[PDB]
């Protein structure tokens, strides 16, 4: 069950300055980057072309190159059409791709945000503003829905190309996507926000894939004061997480941190304070 998402980030600071950068993710692994500085899209995996031939990839890349130049001039022309309602600086974000289900099923999506807020999506055969989007967008969106060539292209990309490409990626990227990296854990303490307390910290790092279990324990008793933090990425495509427990002074003895992960195969790590 994977989500393929191509993310575009476009910044317009004035009539003469703009950059557009993209990244592509298949689940939590980066497959592509496309900096404003490069003509060509760059691979960040050996399998980033999926099962597409060089002919098919060039054709797909070519369309995105056209799109990026056209996007940039279209938006800057749209600034002058609705100025000075909303002036520079302008940030636009696109998130497009598909969710891959079992039995060869998928749902595709194309979402757009303006100034960090969701405003437009592609849906079915047309672009549409979302409820509560600013009303100055209604005319530009009509202008764009009149471009039936763009509409057919986007419909092809969402219905055919996106799930096609991703089926290929999953095959060609099997050994990376199914990789198992083992967590290493360690214990420390930091000051608590409460008096007479110490914050015990169980760190867990280098594990892949993401799902993990970490609990402070006193024997078989789970310590319900265990505060699990967020998953924080390491730079080597593994995950980091820490779980904390604020404890009174003197009450530290007997505590243990216990870690379960699919790469350990039942052999939990258990550290004792």
């Amino acid at each position: 069950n994977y989500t393929f998402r191509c993310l575009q980030m476009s910044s317009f600071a004035n009539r003469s300055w703009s950059r557009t950068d993209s990244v592509v993710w298949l689940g939590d692994l980066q497959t592509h980057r496309w900096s404003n500085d490069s003509a060509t899209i760059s691979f960040t995996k050996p399998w980033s072309q999926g099962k597409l031939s060089n002919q098919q990839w060039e054709k797909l890349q070519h369309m995105f190159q056209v799109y990026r130049v056209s996007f940039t001039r279209d938006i800057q022309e749209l600034v002058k059409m609705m100025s000075p309602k909303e002036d520079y600086p302008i940030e636009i974000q696109l998130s497009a791709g598909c969710e891959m289900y079992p039995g060869n099923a998928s749902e595709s999506f194309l979402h757009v945000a303006f100034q960090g807020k969701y405003v437009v999506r592609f849906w079915g055969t047309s672009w549409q503003t979302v409820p509560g989007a600013p009303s100055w967008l209604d005319l530009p969106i009509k202008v764009l829905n009149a471009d039936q060539g763009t509409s057919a292209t986007v419909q092809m990309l969402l219905n055919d190309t996106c799930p096609l490409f991703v089926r290929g990626l999953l095959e060609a990227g099997k050994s990376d996507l199914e990789k198992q990296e083992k967590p290493v854990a360690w214990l420390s303490s930091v000051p608590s926000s409460a008096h007479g307390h110490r914050q015990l910290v169980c760190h867990v790092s280098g594990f892949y894939p993401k799902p993990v279990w970490v609990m402070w324990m006193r024997g078989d008793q789970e310590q319900q004061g265990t505060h699990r933090g967020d998953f924080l990425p390491n730079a080597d495509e593994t995950w980091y997480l820490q779980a904390t427990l604020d404890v009174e002074a003197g009450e530290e003895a007997g505590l243990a941190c216990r870690v379960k992960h699919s790469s350990l195969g039942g052999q939990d790590i258990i550290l004792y304070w």
Binding site: M9, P233, N234
Partner: protein, 96 residues
């Protein structure tokens, strides 16, 4: 407009005099234009790798800075961020 959160953590358990990597993960910010510096005893560390900028389901941006370091007993490390949502730079120290 949105204020960056900053988290600082090592890749491996820190042993003094053993090579390690120090990460600085900056999240929840908007707009994408940002300066991230990693600091050793208050001076900027020159060779710092940055990931590509990306964003979450909620549209907020994130980015990972990391650098090679080998900890000692007396060296202190931090990550400082300049961003337009903050009149002052925000500094977060590595916990140890």
């Amino acid at each position: 407009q949105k204020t960056p959160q900053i988290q600082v953590y090592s890749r491996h358990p820190p042993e003094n005099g053993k090579p390690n990597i120090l990460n600085c993960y900056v999240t929840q910010f908007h707009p994408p234009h940002i300066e991230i510096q990693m600091l050793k005893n208050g001076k900027k560390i020159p060779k710092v790798e940055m990931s590509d900028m990306s964003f979450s389901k909620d549209w907020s941006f994130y980015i990972l800075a990391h650098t090679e370091f080998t900890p000692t007993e007396t060296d202190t490390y931090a990550c400082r961020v300049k961003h337009a949502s903050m009149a002052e730079p925000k500094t977060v120290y590595w916990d140890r």
